[model samples]
Target: SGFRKMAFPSGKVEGCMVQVTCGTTTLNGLWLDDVVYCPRHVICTSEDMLNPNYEDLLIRKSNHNFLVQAGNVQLRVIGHSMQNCVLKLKVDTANPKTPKYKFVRIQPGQTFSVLACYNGSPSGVYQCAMRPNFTIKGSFLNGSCGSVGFNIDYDCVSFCYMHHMELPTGVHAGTDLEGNFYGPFVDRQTAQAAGTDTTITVNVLAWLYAAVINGDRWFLNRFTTTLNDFNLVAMKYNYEPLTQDHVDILGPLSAQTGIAVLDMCASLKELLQNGMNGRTILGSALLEDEFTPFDVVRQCSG
Candidate 1:
């Protein structure tokens, strides 16, 4: 017969997927820390760079959505099922390091930064899982309610930031600033008719390409998922720009914190329907002449 782990934080014990039967609604009937599992990935940031100008391989904050540094990780919460949820970060393994169990309280749309467990040389890969309390022991069978889980890996995210690059009135409010234009042209018949809505996307794609070359599969997954998510947002907006109201709806739009978290997925549907190229996509410096990662990182650091 299989057994369940009891509710925790108290001096008690029980069995069979242990949980509380409160009057309020519940999510999965598991621990409040039982969040959706994300994929394993590395976290670091260019802003992490130090003197002599090396890759900023460190995260200065704890409440960041991206693991911009292996030592620190962020959890971009999107679930609205409950007002708040307690998250206990743990090692998803048979012999998890007890001292490494990190915990934090999360709101519907916010970044919960926690110290990571796996800090290997190639950075570290952490899991996102939920575990039951320690009370229900004696292990009968089917130890499904283990004390850890929540793989924080996904390809999409809602945003909460400022976005420019428009058609008439904004920052880079014009055609591909970088130049080498490549229209998405889902249909080739009317190539010249490609409008702003027809041109390919920019920054996100550039970021992805950089990741591919840098061999940062962790960030690659994030960028790809975020890229695909832009499509979803476009579909949601009927392939239109996300307005201020919609922008406010960033945190939970099938959400979390990915690149799409900025500017409310604005100007994207238009960009995707088309396509971009090396010149503008890569940046003016990249287009002006030949450059390398060292220069790319240094110049692009802006």
Candidate 2:
């Protein structure tokens, strides 16, 4: 259970009509908290889960919206008046235009922080500006807030791990055109939707590689979103963890597949064990291939 339907799901009390949350706020492989729109990460002495803020927050503020911080650069967008403000990032002279925002609005009290790098590389300088449109409170802003700009630099690239050159083989390259690997098929143009390449793939590969390069499976917890759940699952499986006999019966059927799924014949074995093992152990074991896909490959394969 996640998002609004998660955590405190009940408001049941005698005589009190309650807006009881149900299930979770999680959907389509995302946490509602992470995908919320125009969501406010307001400055608060303490933010609350009031009936679950599913997607919006009750508290909001000024001059703190969309703060950018990378290496030596520290920047903040301040909405001077009630009139709406839009913040845009501009990377000049870079191979690709790496501005990640399109006049994203910043209310008086909301802020978002980001790296000052251009396409994941902090090798150059980029500028950020806010345009205060003549709207509800435009009259309140006395200065030319729309024309001012802030500059961010990549003088710290030499020390940044994401931009390092020593990418050993087997590492999941990156998501950028020049990253460790691309998100999908190597369509040069498809990957650069915005005419520039920027992928959070580095973060994706960093953890995956840790599992491969180091014996520490603990790094895999980053994908679980919650440390507690990862711990519970990992501890359970690793607590007693290996096998085959049934592999013979299930192995022959591995090659069949649907439009997307390759072949369940081999997968049936893992599916069966994955279902029975409660996920953690078998999945991690498969990742390590304690034994390794295919018209098919099952619990282990070619």
Candidate 3:
């Protein structure tokens, strides 16, 4: 059979399991809109909210990856106890209504705001407001339950505007404003003591991070993997400090590049290991003028 209904100890009711064959490939744990037929310990629901926010209640004792896809948004909950959860949108109206867990279409120049609620209140850590089509990612904390990671895939514009800028001398390459080495070696003495190669691999990531931060086309062109991967996925779903304009001029360059999309989590892990902690690169508000994009990047990247 292609599908079957199954019971889960962690769930109050049973869910389905599915496997589908396509030409030469097969897809298992089928994830469809508003519902998912996944393996054991996975909770699938289209229900709006869980716990005190809504009348419906979810299992509080066990841990499971809760798959919630409704109202044009999808939520993947990392394993944790389920105390409370909801995503609310702020819509401008002559007669404002209560925020609901639903999707509202937004156009360019329109303001979009979201409140990721836990235990019925807007979480200071997980809520955000940004123009539509911009990426938003971050973790939401649930009381008694653990933190949940999320990345929102907003609708895209034809062309996104990139704020190309130059980093000051020694900013992303040789040293910080404080003159400290731009990375893992700390200083020449430290590299010498560890017998590490200071010339290569030391400040390359700094260049990439800076490229990502400032939208430097020349720098990113050198590492087309970063550029292509970012264009394919991160541009579609995650935060990049960029904007949307009339037409996409640079799309053809990245088209059919066949580069593997970089995983945001894995890339950040490497950055962290190389001494660019997530807090500094992501958490800190680098561009005070454009705080929303950077904040969304940090939240989801975390």
Candidate 4:
């Protein structure tokens, strides 16, 4: 009942014989004009038959490459390891005797537009230049984002529904000897390595607040990641969504903040869902319990 071997060696058949392995079995098939006829008939193009990360890869790629004339793109500048950064959008020009590149400096949370035509190559280059020094305290170690350098030839426009803020990575914040906040500054290798630990431990509510106020997908995604951790912990604590089980776990704190955090959580969830649903409703519908703010908390708390 299973195919073990096959041969398509007929010269005049106008097809090629290709051998491929499927599910631990060698399959031989005739690759015809535009299709392949296999004995198992395993043709598929669905989510179940593909890698789950394929969608993420596709989305990443879609955001990576684009023409300069793409029109009204939502370009966002994110400072990877520096703050008080200057975003330079430079235009390539043909005036060799004059200033070869015309550029503009964009401040944080600023909007800008560019209108130019290109012939052979892209005429725009974007770079985030670090202006501030690494203001670290109690450190003999030294490092810098300016030394490392940062620039992007082309990238996808970041579009979100809230204010945009660029955050510095590979940096740390601590208090000085006088108990005043020292710096959001870079340190040695330890600073880089400790990024994940610092970010993951931050409160999801703070992340939501940051995402909504100083908007970015990274912050929102971080919020979701921490929220998932809480989701797991909630279940471990028997925090049933259908009942007031988590309220008991909340205890006095529950009465203090009431459902403020829960409300914010619902808003964040709905924001993400609406964004995804806007892509299309072919696979998911935005209605009923799925889109409701209250039920999101109800189902999420559980």
Error of 3 at 283 (Å): 10
Candidate 3 residue 210 C-alpha distance from true site, Å: 11
Q: Which lDDT tens digits does candidate 2 get at residues 57-78?
A: 2224334333322223332332
Question: In model 2, which range of ten residues has the least summed lDDT?
Answer: 1-10
Residue range with the least summed lDDT across 10 consecutive positions in model 1: 128-137
| lDDT of the structure predicted as candidate 4 | 0.24
Every model's Cα RMSD, please? Answer: 24.3, 22.8, 21.8, 24.8
Clash pairs (backbone) in predicted model 4:
163-215, 241-302
Q: Candidate 3: which stretches are off by over 4 Å?
A: 1-96, 99-114, 125-138, 143-302
In model 4, the runs with Cα more than 4 Å from the true position are 1-175, 178-192, 195-230, 233-260, 270-302
lDDT for residue 291 in candidate 2, whole number 0-100: 16
| Candidate with more favorable, higher TM-score: 2 or 4 | 2
Ranking by TM-score: 2, 3, 1, 4
TM-score of each: 0.19, 0.20, 0.20, 0.18
Q: Candidate 3 lDDT, tens digit per residue, 40-156?
A: 112222232121222233343232223333223333433332211221111111112111112233222222222223322223322322222222222232120111111233321
The superposed Cα distance between candidate 1 and the true structure at residue 183, in angstroms, equals: 38
